Design a protein around this ligand. Structure first.
Ligand SMILES: NC(=O)c1ncn([C@@H]2O[C@H](COP(=O)(O)O)[C@@H](O)[C@H]2O)c1N
Length: 246
């Protein structure tokens, strides 16, 4: 593989919080949670292993089953590394609270489906501290913890591009928590549709899968979120970082 000056693929280990625990689901389905203990210990583990980013989700807030605001605040404050924070960020107050944690950026999901004028305003005011999470089954967007129906993926990308959105985080729900491998086709198709950076999520199962996503960096894929493969020890984060470096 020929040398290049392009950046390497960024890795964002996930810490998804439900009922006070770091959890992994299958297709994000409520009730399929596997718990891996405290979110703080999980986050600090990834930081010790050399993580540059943490992808931190309050899943109770996404589902609407209470929240974990104090814990995700504490985790964010403990990180020296960059933190991408999401879950429940759907109006001015929840956005203000999220930003006050000192996270590096937030992801908006449901609000891009239910409150597009508000998302447009937030993008215009906050720039690259905002990314939109586009979570699909096929090309159909889903909200509210993936329990609600949104529209077509590409319609949304076209609108959000025009509104000046900086970055998209794209999950294939059918791959998430499955260790089936990532949907590379989805990533290539999204990169064909937008010139903004794209962060992949869902299905990574192996170092070879990360290498495959890394090949798409020159198409526009900036990073990869990894959950179950790290928690289930398919590989270490040290190994994953070396795999995408070189
Ligand atoms: N069911 C799930 O696993 C799930 N549901 C939502 N999410 C994440 O929650 C966040 C969106 O929350 P909201 O829709 O409240 O903005 C995004 O990061 C999105 O990927 C999940 N990981």
């Amino acid at each position: 593989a020929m040398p290049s000056k392009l950046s390497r693929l960024e890795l964002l280990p996930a810490v998804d919080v439900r009922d006070g625990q770091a959890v992994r689901l299958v297709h994000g389905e409520s009730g399929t949670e596997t718990s891996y203990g405290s979110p703080l210990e999980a986050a600090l583990s990834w930081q010790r292993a050399g993580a540059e980013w943490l992808h931190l989700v309050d899943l109770d807030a996404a589902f609407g089953t209470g929240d974990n605001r104090e814990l995700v605040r504490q985790v964010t404050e403990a990180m020296d590394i960059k933190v991408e924070l999401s879950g429940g960020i759907r109006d001015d107050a929840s956005l203000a609270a999220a930003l006050a944690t000192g996270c590096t950026r937030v992801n908006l999901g449901t609000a891009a489906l239910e409150s597009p004028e508000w998302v447009a305003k937030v993008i215009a005011e906050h720039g690259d501290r905002i990314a939109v999470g586009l979570d699909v089954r096929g090309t159909t967007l889903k909200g509210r913890g993936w329990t609600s129906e949104g529209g077509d993926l590409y319609e949304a990308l076209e609108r959000l591009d025009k509104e000046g959105c900086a970055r998209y985080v794209v999950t294939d729900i059918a791959k998430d928590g499955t260790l089936q491998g990532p949907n590379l086709e989805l990533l290539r198709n999204v990169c064909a549709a937008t010139d903004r950076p794209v962060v992949a999520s869902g299905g990574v199962s192996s170092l070879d899968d990360l290498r495959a996503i890394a090949e798409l960096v020159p198409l526009g894929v900036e990073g990869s979120i990894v959950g179950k493969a790290l928690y289930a020890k398919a590989f270490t984060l040290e190994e994953a970082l070396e795999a995408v470096a070189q």
